[PDB]
Design a protein around this ligand. Structure first.
Ligand code: FEC
Ligand code: FEC
Ligand code: FEC
Ligand SMILES: [Fe+3]
Ligand SMILES: [Fe+3]
Ligand SMILES: [Fe+3]
Ligand SMILES: [Fe+3]
Ligand SMILES: [Fe+3]
Ligand SMILES: [Fe+3]
Ligand SMILES: [Fe+3]
Ligand SMILES: [Fe+3]
Ligand SMILES: [Fe+3]
Ligand SMILES: [Fe+3]
Ligand SMILES: [Fe+3]
Ligand SMILES: [Fe+3]
Ligand SMILES: [Fe+3]
Ligand SMILES: [Fe+3]
Lengths: 170, 169, 170, 169, 170, 170, 170
C-alpha cells in the first residue's frame, strides 16, 4: 500500500487496542473498589497497580496514534461488568487478559504487514506485560478456587497502599 | 428514611463521578494534542490536571462504596476532539466553572440529606476545581494577550510529569 | 590393593554418587517448576535451593574424580518422575534422601577400606547435608498430611525468589 | 486455532530445552578438564557459560509450564568427554552455531503460531548464544595461533566464578 | 540459500545501511557547523548529539558485518548538501530520517528472510532510534514554520555544549 | 458427457466422500477410546454416536456407488491422529467437519453438473448432518475453553452408554 | 518379564488382533454391498450382522489396549479384496475365519505366558464368536457349491433389514 494507507490501517488496530485498554482500566478499577470495600487490601492494591499499567498502555497507544497522524479514541470496547464476587473477578480478568494477548498478536501481525516496525515493537512490549497480568490473575483465581477461606483470611485487613499519592496539579 | 437519604447522595456522587470520567478523557485528549504540537509545559500540566481528576473519580467511587452503592463507569457527555490551542483553554475554563456550579448544587443535596462526610468531600474537591479553573483562565489570558510570543516560549519545553507512575509490572 | 586399584574403586563409588546427584537435580527442578506453576513460592524456592545443593555435590564429586585421575560421569541414575502432586513430591523426596544417605554411607565405607581419607571426608560432609534435606522434606510432608490445605493456603502467593540472578557469562 | 498452535510451540520449547540440558553437561564436563589442567580463566568462563545454559533451560521450562506442557528431563545428544583444549573450543563454537541455527527456526515456528511471548524468549536467548559463540571462536583462535605464551598467561590464574551460590544448607 | 549466501545477502544490506549512516554523520555535522556558526546553541548541540547516534549506528553495523565475515564499507551513500538554510535543514533531515526508517524496514525483512535473527534485532533497535530523530526534526521544523524568528530568538545565544569533551587518546 | 462418463464422474466424488467418512470413523472412534479411558462418559458416548453417523454415511455412499455400478472404496483419506488431548480433540473435529461440508458442497456441484439429482440429494441430506456435528464440536470446544475444569468435573464419571448393545450375528 | 514388559507384549498381540478385525469389517461390508446390490437380502443382512460383530470385537480389543496403557491401532491388517463373486465370498470368509481362530489361539497363548488372565478370557470369548462365524460361512458356501441357483432362488428378493436403524447422534 501507499504511505497514508499503511498508517490508516495501523492507526485502526491501535485504536482498537486503545479501546480495549480503556475498558480494562474501568473494569479493573471497578473491581478494585469492591476489593477495597471488602477489606482485601493486597488484592485491591495489586488490582489498582494493574489498572495503572493499562492506563500506561492506553497512553502509549495514543502517543503512537498521534505520531502517525490519527485521533486517539475515547470510547471503551465493550461493557464493564459490575458487582462481581471475588472468585468471578479473577476468573473474568484472566479470560480478559488471555483475549487481549490473542487480539494484540493479531494487531502485531497487521503492523508487520503494513511495514510498521516501531508500532509492532510497541505491541510486543505491551503483550509481555499482558502476560504478567494474566499469570497474576490465573494464580489468584487458583488459590481462591482451591484454598477458600484460609487464603482470604490471610488477605483480610492487609495494607492496600499502592505507594505515595500520584503526582497531580494541585 | 435512611435508605432514601443514601440513594439521593449516591446519585449526585455518581453524577459527579461521571463528570470526572469525562474530564479525564477530555483533558488527556488535549494532552495528546499539546504533546504532539510539542508544547511540553502545556502538555505536562494538562496531564497533571487529568490525574487530579482521576483522584476525584476514585474518591467519589470510594464514598459511593461506603454508602453501599455502585460507582458508575460511564462518563457524562462527549469528548470534543481536534480543538485549537485557544479553544482548549477557553472550553476547559468553561467546563471547570460548570463543574464547580454543579458540585455546589450536589453539596447542598448532601447537606439536605444530612450527609456531612459526603458534603466535606465535595467541599475539598470544589477547592481543587477552583485551582484548575484559575490555571485555565491564566493560560487562556496569556494566549489571548501574547499570542505566538507565548507559544514561542512553550515550544520545545520539557513535557515530563515526573517519574513514571507506580504500575504492576 | 595397589595404588591404581584403590583409586579405581573410589572413582567408581564417586561416579555412582555423582549419577545420583544428577538425577536429584533433574527431579527436584522438575518439582520446582510444578510448585512454581502452582504459585507456592516458599515451597518452590526451597526446592530450587536444595537442587542447587545437589549441583554443588555433583561438582564436588566430579572434582574429586578428576583429582583421582578419573572421568566424571554425565549420566543420571534412574528415571525422573513427572506430574507428581504436592503430597507425593514430599513423600517421594524424603524416601530418596533417606536412600541417598544409606547409599553414601556404604560408599563412605568403601573409601575407608581403600585408605582414601580425603574422599571419605567429602562423603561425610555431604551426608550431613543430605540429612538437612531429609529433615526438611519430612517436615513439609508431615504438615501437608496433618493439616492439608489449611497449611498450603498459607504458602500460596508467597515470594519464590531464591536471591540474586545467577552469576553467568553474559 | 489456539490448541494446535500451543502444541506446536511446546514442542519446539522442549526441543530447545533438551539442547540446553546437553550444553550444561557438555560444558561442565570441559570445565572439569580445564580446572584439572589449572587454566583458571578458561575454567571459570566455561562454568559461567554453563550457568547461562542452566538459566536458559529454566526459562524454557517456565514458559512450557505457562503453556500447560511438561518440561523435558532428557538431554539431546551425547556428551563428549576427554576433549583436548583445541577440540574443546572448536567443538563448542560449532555447537553454539548450530544452536543459533536451530533456535532461529524454532523462533520462526513461534511467529507462525502467533506466540509473541515465546518468540521474544527465543530472541533474547539467541543473542546470548551469539555471545557464547564469539567467546569460543576467539579462544579457539588464540589457542591455534598464539601458542605457549598464550597458555602460560592463563596458567595458574584464578578459577573462581564468585561466591558459592545460594543453596539450602 | 546456503550459509555463505545467507551471510553475503545480510552483509550487503548491512553495508548499504552503514553507507547511509556515514552520509548522515557528514550531513548532520555539516549542519551542526552552520547552526553553531549562527550561534543557535541548543539546535547546534542536539544536531551533533544526533550525529553521534549515527556514529554509533555505523559502528554497530560494522561490528556485525565483521561478525559475519564481511568488510565494513568506508563510502557514504549519496552527496552531502551544504549551505542549507535553517528551514531546509529541518525539512530535509525529517525527510531523510523517514527514508531511512523505510529503507531499514526493508533491510530488516531481508534479515528475517535470511534467517538472521541477531541482525534483525540490530535493525529493530536502530529503527526505534531513527524514529526519535524523525520526531525531533519534525518538531523543530514545525516550530520554525509556525513561529519563525520568534522561536529562533529564543535559541539565539543558548549554550551549545554537548557535555564533557569526548574520550580520546591524548 | 455420455451416460457412463456422467456415472464415472459421480462415482469418483462419491468414493472421495466415502474415503472421508472412513477416516472420520477411525478418527472419532480413536478419540472415543481416549474419552472413555478418561472416564468422561457423556463426551465418550456422543463421540461414538457421531462416529456411528459417519458409518451410516459411509454405507449410504457405498449403496449409491453400487446403484451407479461402481465399486465402493475401502481406504480412508488421510491419516488418523492419535494421542490427542481433549481441547485438541474438539478443535480438530470442528475443523474437520467444516472441511467436510466444504468438500461435500463441491461434490454436490459435480453431481448437479453431471445431471445426477439422486446423488445431489444424498449429499444435501448428509451435509445437513455434518452441520449438526460441526455445531456440536464447536459447542464442546467453547465449554472447555470458557469453563475449563468446572465443565469437565460435571462430565467426570457420567454414563458412557450409547444404548442397547448393537444387533450382531451371534 | 517385568510389569511393563508383560503389558507391552499383550498390547502387541491385541493390536494385531484389532488390525485383523478392522480388515474383517471392511472386507465383509464390501461383500454386503455386493450381496445387497444383487438383491440377496438374507445373505446381505447376515453379512452385515457379522461385520457388526467384528466392529464390537475391534472395540473390545481397543478398550483392553487402553486398560493396559497402550494405543489402539487404526490400521487394518491385509488387503481387502473387492468385486468378489458369490461362490468366492463364502469360500474366502470361511478361510479367513479359520485363520483368525488359529491366530487368536496363538495370541491367547501369549496372554497366558504374560500372566494376563483378563486378556486371555477376552480372546477366549471372541474365538467362540469367530467359530459361529466360521460355521455360518461354511454352511452357505456348501449350499452355493452343491445347490447353486436353486438355493439362491430362495434368497432372491428376501428382506435385507438387520432391524432398526442403529442409534446415532443426529
Ligand atoms: C482512579 C483512576 C482512574 C479512574 C477509573 C475509574 O473507573 O474510576 C483513572 C483513569 C484513567 C483513564 C481512563 C486513563 C486513560 C486516558 C486516555 O488515554 O484517554 C488514565 C490514564 C493515566 N492514568 Fe489514571 N487514567 N491514574 C491513576 C488513577 C486513576 N486513573 C493513578 C493513581 C495514577 C498514578 C500513576 C503514577 O503515579 O505513576 C494514574 C496515572 C495515569 C497516567 C500516568 C502515566 C505515567 O506517567 O506513567 C495515565 C496516562
Ligand atoms: C555443578 C553444576 C551442575 C552439574 C552439571 C554436570 O553435568 O556436572 C549443574 C547442573 C544443572 C542442571 C542440569 C540444571 C537444569 C535444571 C532443569 O532445568 O531441570 C541446572 C539448573 C540451574 N543451575 Fe546448575 N543446573 N548451578 C550451578 C552448578 C551446577 N549446575 C551453580 C554453581 C549455580 C549458581 C547459582 C546462582 O548463582 O544462581 C547454578 C545455578 C542453576 C540455576 C539457577 C539460575 C538462576 O537462578 O539465575 C538453575 C535453574
Ligand atoms: C466399534 C466400531 C467400529 C471400529 C472403529 C475403530 O476404529 O475402532 C466400527 C467400524 C465401522 C466401519 C469402519 C464401518 C464402514 C464399513 C464400510 O462401509 O465398509 C462401519 C459401518 C457400520 N457400522 Fe460400525 N462400522 N458400528 C458400531 C461399532 C463400530 N463400527 C456399532 C456399535 C454400531 C451400532 C448400530 C446401530 O445401532 O446403529 C455400528 C453400526 C454400523 C453400521 C450400521 C448402520 C445402520 O444400519 O443404521 C454400519 C454401516
Ligand atoms: Fe493493557
Ligand atoms: Fe492487561
Ligand atoms: Fe475533578
Ligand atoms: Fe477539574
Ligand atoms: Fe546430594
Ligand atoms: Fe539431597
Ligand atoms: Fe543456551
Ligand atoms: Fe550457548
Ligand atoms: Fe542512524
Ligand atoms: Fe537517524
Ligand atoms: Fe459424515
Ligand atoms: Fe461428520
Ligand atoms: Fe472378530
Ligand atoms: Fe469373525
Amino acid at each position: 500500500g501507499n504511505r497514508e494507507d499503511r498508517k490508516a490501517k495501523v492507526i485502526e488496530v491501535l485504536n482498537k487496542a486503545r479501546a480495549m485498554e480503556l475498558h480494562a482500566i474501568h473494569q479493573y478499577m471497578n473491581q478494585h473498589y469492591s476489593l477495597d470495600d471488602m477489606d482485601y487490601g493486597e488484592l485491591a492494591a495489586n488490582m489498582k497497580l494493574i489498572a495503572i499499567d493499562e492506563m500506561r498502555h492506553a497512553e502509549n497507544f495514543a502517543e503512537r496514534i498521534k505520531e502517525l497522524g490519527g485521533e486517539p479514541t475515547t470510547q471503551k470496547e465493550g461493557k464493564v461488568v459490575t458487582g462481581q464476587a471475588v472468585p468471578v473477578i479473577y476468573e473474568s480478568d484472566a479470560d480478559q487478559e488471555d483475549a487481549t494477548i490473542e487480539a494484540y498478536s493479531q494487531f502485531l501481525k497487521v503492523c508487520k504487514e503494513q511495514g510498521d516496525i516501531v508500532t509492532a515493537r510497541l505491541f510486543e512490549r505491551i503483550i509481555e506485560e499482558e502476560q504478567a497480568h494474566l499469570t497474576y490473575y490465573e494464580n489468584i483465581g487458583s488459590h481462591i478456587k482451591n484454598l477458600g477461606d484460609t487464603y482470604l483470611a490471610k488477605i483480610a485487613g492487609t495494607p492496600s497502599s499502592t505507594g505515595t499519592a500520584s503526582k497531580g496539579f494541585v
